[PDB]
Design a protein around this motif. Sequence first.
Motif, mmCIF file in Angstrom:
data_model
loop_
_atom_site.group_PDB
_atom_site.id
_atom_site.type_symbol
_atom_site.label_atom_id
_atom_site.label_comp_id
_atom_site.label_asym_id
_atom_site.label_seq_id
_atom_site.Cartn_x
_atom_site.Cartn_y
_atom_site.Cartn_z
ATOM 1 N N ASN B 295 0.833 -1.202 0.000
ATOM 2 C CA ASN B 295 0.000 0.000 0.000
ATOM 3 C C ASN B 295 0.870 1.256 0.000
ATOM 4 O O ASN B 295 0.873 2.051 0.939
ATOM 5 C CB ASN B 295 -0.950 -0.018 1.192
ATOM 6 C CG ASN B 295 -1.763 -1.292 1.265
ATOM 7 O OD1 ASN B 295 -2.202 -1.819 0.243
ATOM 8 N ND2 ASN B 295 -1.966 -1.798 2.475
ATOM 9 N N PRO B 297 1.428 4.754 -1.701
ATOM 10 C CA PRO B 297 0.832 5.740 -2.615
ATOM 11 C C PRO B 297 1.776 6.195 -3.710
ATOM 12 O O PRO B 297 1.321 6.503 -4.819
ATOM 13 C CB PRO B 297 0.452 6.896 -1.679
ATOM 14 C CG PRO B 297 1.352 6.742 -0.504
ATOM 15 C CD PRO B 297 1.540 5.266 -0.326
ATOM 16 N N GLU B 300 1.716 2.491 -6.490
ATOM 17 C CA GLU B 300 0.622 1.668 -5.983
ATOM 18 C C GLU B 300 0.891 0.182 -6.199
ATOM 19 O O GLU B 300 1.063 -0.576 -5.236
ATOM 20 C CB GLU B 300 -0.697 2.100 -6.635
ATOM 21 C CG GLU B 300 -0.642 2.313 -8.147
ATOM 22 C CD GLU B 300 -0.188 3.710 -8.533
ATOM 23 O OE1 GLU B 300 0.355 4.423 -7.665
ATOM 24 O OE2 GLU B 300 -0.374 4.092 -9.707
#
Lengths: 130, 381
Positions: B295, B297, B300
């Motif tokens: 996970n 950002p 991804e």
Amino acid sequence: MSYSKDIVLEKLASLEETQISIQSIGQWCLFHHRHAPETVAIWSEFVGSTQTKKLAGLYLANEIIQQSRAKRKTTFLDEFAKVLPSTLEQIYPSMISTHQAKLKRIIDVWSQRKIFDSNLIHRLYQSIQD
Amino acid sequence: MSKEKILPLAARSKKAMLRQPKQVAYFSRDLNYKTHPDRSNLSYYYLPDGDIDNSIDLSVGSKHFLLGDSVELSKLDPILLALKEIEKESGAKTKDRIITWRGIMRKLLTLPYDSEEDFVLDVVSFDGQLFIQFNVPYLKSKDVQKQGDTEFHKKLQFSGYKFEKMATLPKPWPECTRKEIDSRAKSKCNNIEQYGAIVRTGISRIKILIGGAVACTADYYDENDPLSRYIELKTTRTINQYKDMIAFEKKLFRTWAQCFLLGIPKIIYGFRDDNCILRTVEEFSTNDIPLMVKNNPLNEQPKKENCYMSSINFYGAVVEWLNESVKDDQVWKLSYAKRNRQYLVLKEVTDENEKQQIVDSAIPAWFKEWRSELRNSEGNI
């Protein structure tokens, strides 16, 4: 800053167990590598004449050998080694139990770092009388 | 023709699940390489924020830093001593199948994604239990290369050890005094003294007993469940860009393996700069690492392939391969070559002199005769 015996004598009298003073004195010794025989002679005389500051001198010599290898200063190694065992002879008698403990610890430290040659290593253990 | 068996790197085991780790014994290794069943080497974690704001340097003291003998450290002497004690008060042989240090398992488990170093490992099938350790000639060769490995890596290793030393205490915080708390910077760091634990575990239907290095307990020794309070300390260069993040991710993969093989819950890093100055410190949880990695950002999911699950399956396949391949009283040489990049090589040894010397080097005589006495007393019951 010119090199002279009196400055080296004062600096040798100026050692303390604090690492900053020891490393500053080592840097000063580095800056005057051209007159190294005078430096080692003054160091030997002072260490043979000192009473309590022996451990600081041992630390200083150890570190200086270390960055001499870092700086590839080959002559420094045997330059101290010419008088190092005899110096240990004069240092041992007036030196207390905890200090033999730390001295043999540092002796193993030199031995395991490929600092010195085998004959010199063996004469160092015969210097420590153990 | 010495028998050789091949394990492809892509092999996986679907039914691979790992049993819960469980400590059975612990050891303390003094400077004289003597192993004792106590907790003198145990240290206690302590690191408030003020020390972080103090901007502690790490390179200080490297001049008088000791170093340990690689062969002496790799010796299975403490693990085997603990095993002998366990059998002595147990009165019977254990059900364990594989005995080894934790580092070997970490190295072989990371191979599908972290296999950038070569190694030679020894397999000894004595008394029905395989004993695994590094190859002594390989150890000496590696020592030669390490001696010819500049000094920057030595500086990094000393930075790690100094960071460990600066955040530990010989006694629990209530019992300590000011002089020993604030004289940590004046301590002489060394890699010989350490505290380790013996953990029973295993994958599939195989019971595996391993040992590893433990930095310190969290705040006190929980006798009921020591594994809950354990914590290890590591150091890493500070990150400032995406490439730094990727290198950090690889380091986390390696460390998560390092830790999950023992099931230690927490992880701490010391974020140092190029000047050996500790900037920041942040923690982690062992189970949360894979989810945190996946996970991200910033990136991804370029690929959904879970590295951790594939690694676990590969490790289970390797364990099954080791179990099935070798029978009793057979010594096999295990090694990997970086040039391969395709699969793993496992070969047997047939030289009687070589077999005998390898067995003697790996296994101490007193353990062998004690096991013989145990076997005879089994028939003497």
